[PDB]
Amino acid sequence: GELRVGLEESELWLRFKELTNEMIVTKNGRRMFPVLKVNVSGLDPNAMYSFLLDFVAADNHRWKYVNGEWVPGGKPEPQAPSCVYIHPDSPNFGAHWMKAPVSFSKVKLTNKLNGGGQIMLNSLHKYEPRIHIVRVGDPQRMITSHCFPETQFIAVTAYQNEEITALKIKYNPFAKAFLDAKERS
Amino acid sequence: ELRVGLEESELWLRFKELTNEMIVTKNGRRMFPVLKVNVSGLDPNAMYSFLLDFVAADNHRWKYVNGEWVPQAPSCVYIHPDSPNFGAHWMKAPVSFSKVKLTNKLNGGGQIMLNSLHKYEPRIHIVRVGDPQRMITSHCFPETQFIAVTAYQNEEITALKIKYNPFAKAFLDAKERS
DNA sequence: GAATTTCACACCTAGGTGTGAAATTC
DNA sequence: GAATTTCACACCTAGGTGTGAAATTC
Ligand code: NA
């Protein structure tokens, strides 16, 4: 159709996804890396929208890193998608959302109910980021949802795959101290 | 019904008594203290934007002579970054203009150009988004008057800045050490 | 000269990284 | 016993302070 939400920097995302991506969750909440950013077109420049982010459980079980490989390791469990995170620019005009990429750089993932906007995930479960565009002031309350398969990841309390850790060190600026340390060897 | 009151007024008057001063720089300088207001009496479900500008507090240039201050169009506006937003949001917690930058030359976004050694009064405006009538409220805060400067001149003001602005903790610590 | 502005600087606030040892968990 | 979670730590990014010598204006 006319509404288009495209993943930005999809090739960085794909490098993580080849290895099976992992996202740290902590007690106090952990930012994602890479950050989910999208390009939006086809909105009404003059309408009002809010952007929401939640995380759909990518399957019905859990996951285990056994001998350098991820292994389905659970008996089936229920349904729940996560709570929602509201993009901080919400609410805003379509034109604002279309002028630059919509970046969810401040969402924090956690493994505990204490949500200052934090998204509680279940460790060792796999998730698929999903973005909702909510039209504000609409008597029909129209909402459109987009999933981003290349951003799937497994929530962990510590990195399992050492190749993931290396990629995170390579590209996340807040991890630069470990990057420079590897270039020292 | 619509009320907009100054937050942390007593920290402002401590500055006000000494004649308050705000640094401007080429790029842009944050205010200290930060202007924060409480809002009540908005429609919780209506959409509003909050705007900030600065009005001339008098007609004189100023200069500092032996420990005393002796003896102009409105500034551009700064839109609070939470705009646009529901009345509920503006009312749930103080509205704080913590990221506005005061400058002597516009060279970037989020900046208000003032002209140095003049006295200015902050003014806040509220507008309803989509209001078919062109309707604005304005709210002045004489307690927050100040003189723009490129360097502090009353040493007593600098002392208060160092005492209360957390980003100047290195100079507070230093003086405690001496 | 005297008055006002710019600047590089040291030192903070504020907060995001993975590490690795220890605690917890089943 | 061993998988999972916790958490104090060093080391970053990012950027807000006043300072004082230097530059600019007057
Ligand atoms: Na400027």
Residue numbers in the entry:
A (entry chain B): 40 to 224
B (entry chain A): 41 to 111, 118 to 224
Reproduce the article's own wording on this structure.
Brachyury is a transcription factor that plays an essential role in tumour growth of the rare bone cancer chordoma and is implicated in other solid tumours. Brachyury (encoded by the TBXT gene, also formerly known as T) is the founding member of the family and was first identified in 19275. All T-box proteins recognize a common consensus sequence named the T-box binding element (AGGTGTGAAA) with family member-specific variations found in the preferences for repeats, orientations (inverted or tandem), and spacing of such repeats.
As would be expected with only a single substitution, the structures of the WT and G177D variant are very similar (RMSD 0.8 Å) with only minor differences seen in the ordering and conformations of various loops that are presumably flexible. The G177D substitution itself lies in a loop between strands F and G and is situated away from the DNA interface on the opposite side of the protein. The PHI and PSI angles adopted by the glycine are not permitted for a non-glycine residue, particularly in the case of a pre-proline which is more restrictive due to steric hindrance around the proline Cδ. The G177D substitution is however close to the site of the small protein interface that is created between subunits when binding on DNA containing T-box binding sites in a palindromic arrangement. Analysis of the interfaces between subunits using the program PISA22 reveals some very minor differences in the interface areas (210 Å2 for the G177D versus 219 Å2 for the WT) and in the calculated energetic contributions towards toward complex formation (−4.8 Kcal/mol versus −4.5 Kcal/Mol); we consider these differences to be unlikely to have a role in the biological activity of brachyury.
